[PDB]
């Protein structure tokens, strides 16, 4: 029984530019089992209407998942990704960092 | 075109 | 080369009904259709413009194809609880992947078809497309099973054969996009860490197909060791990104280059900030 936490990486699909539009990602990948529950954050609060890509899996078996929404970033507002798994025993966030 | 199904495991 | 994929997850649920079955397909780097049994409406559904236009009677097939297989997917799992005596209480995971590859002939190179059981290798069709590898006893149970019926002769006629000849026809179809490569964007980027150390970060954005090799250089020669990769991902839109940074002592940035190596750069990148 493999138990393994997933990779979480926050990014935009294109480089980001205050209020023009544009995806917010976050991948998830290297998890096992595939049971995952993935949410995005607009300053602290949750996104709804946020899609997902189909579950699919690496060389190695671990599954891996894109989350997306449509956005438009500005200078003050703070983005983040919420990941809960049996891996984890609270919650994680990472936060979008525009790099 | 995905394959045919086989047998069980 | 290119590749046509397929990728399967069934998952048990005790006491929430049947096992869930979902399937992927992948031309290279493209997904073109996805199966999920707990779908609204479980069918076959495109991902790719170029099955789109494939009729009615060819999605119906591929569909039929699906809930066969998750049919024999929930005995399988039924089956493997109870080669290793597991509690029927407990959630299990059964996944496959089987593709086949072109050579750069564009004949057939090579197949495969493997079987993992919660995680963990379980059972392969070898190299030849003829023999079994079995991870441990209970696979031995499987691999007596599928070769009394020639499992091996059926699925290599799959890989050897239909497989080729449906990559070929996707190939052909959505060639605008399946045969084209698209070039990374590149930049790099630099960050101040201490009077004595920084940070040089190689970006390459938008690039298609995923593989590609960033690798940064000291005075020409390849540094592998101080340099950080991210795993490479998807930007959502079919192309994907990746970023490599190397710890260089402040002040000599200008001695390191990034080198990108993509199908779609005609001649290897060297960056330097």
């Known amino acids: 029984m493999i138990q393994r936490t997933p990779k979480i990486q926050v990014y935009s699909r294109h480089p980001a530019e205050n209020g023009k539009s544009n995806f917010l990602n976050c991948y998830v990948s290297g998890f096992h089992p595939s049971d995952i529950e993935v949410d995005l954050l607009k300053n602290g609060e949750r996104i709804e209407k946020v899609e997902h890509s189909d579950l699919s899996f690496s060389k190695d078996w671990s599954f891996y998942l894109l989350y997306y929404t449509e956005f438009t970033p500005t200078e003050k507002d703070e983005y983040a990704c919420r990941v809960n798994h049996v891996t984890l025993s609270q919650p994680k966030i990472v936060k979008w960092d525009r790099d | ?9 | 080369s290119h590749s046509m994929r397929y990728f399967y997850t069934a998952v048990s649920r005790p006491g929430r009904g049947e096992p869930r079955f979902i399937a992927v397909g992948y031309v290279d780097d493209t997904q073109f259709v996805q199966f999920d049994s707990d779908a609204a409406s479980p069918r076959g559904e495109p991902r790719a413009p170029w099955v789109e236009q494939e009729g009615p009677e060819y999605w119906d097939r591929e569909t039929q194809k699906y809930k066969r297989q998750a049919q024999t997917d929930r005995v399988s799992l039924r089956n493997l609880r109870g080669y290793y005596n597991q509690s029927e209480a407990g959630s299990h995971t059964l996944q496959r992947m089987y593709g086949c590859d072109l050579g750069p002939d564009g004949r057939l190179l090579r197949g495969y078809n493997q079987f993992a059981y919660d995680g963990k290798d379980y059972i392969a069709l070898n190299e030849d497309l003829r023999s079994w590898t079995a991870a441990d006893k209970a696979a031995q149970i499987t691999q007596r099973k599928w070769e009394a019926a020639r499992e091996a002769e059926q699925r290599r006629a799959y890989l050897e054969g239909t497989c080729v000849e449906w990559l070929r026809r996707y190939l052909e179809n959505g060639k605008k996009t399946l045969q084209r490569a698209e070039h990374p964007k590149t930049h790099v980027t630099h960050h101040p860490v201490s009077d004595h150390e920084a940070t040089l970060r190689c970006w390459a954005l938008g690039f298609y197909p995923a593989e590609i090799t960033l690798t940064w250089q000291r005075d020409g020669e390849d540094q592998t060791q101080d340099t950080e990769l991210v795993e490479t991902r998807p930007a959502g839109d079919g192309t994907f990104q990746k970023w490599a940074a190397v710890v260089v002592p402040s002040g000599e940035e200008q001695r390191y280059t990034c080198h990108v190596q993509h199908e779609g750069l005609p001649e290897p990148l060297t960056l330097r900030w």
């Open chain 2, 1 to 9: 075109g995905a394959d045919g199904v086989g047998k069980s495991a």
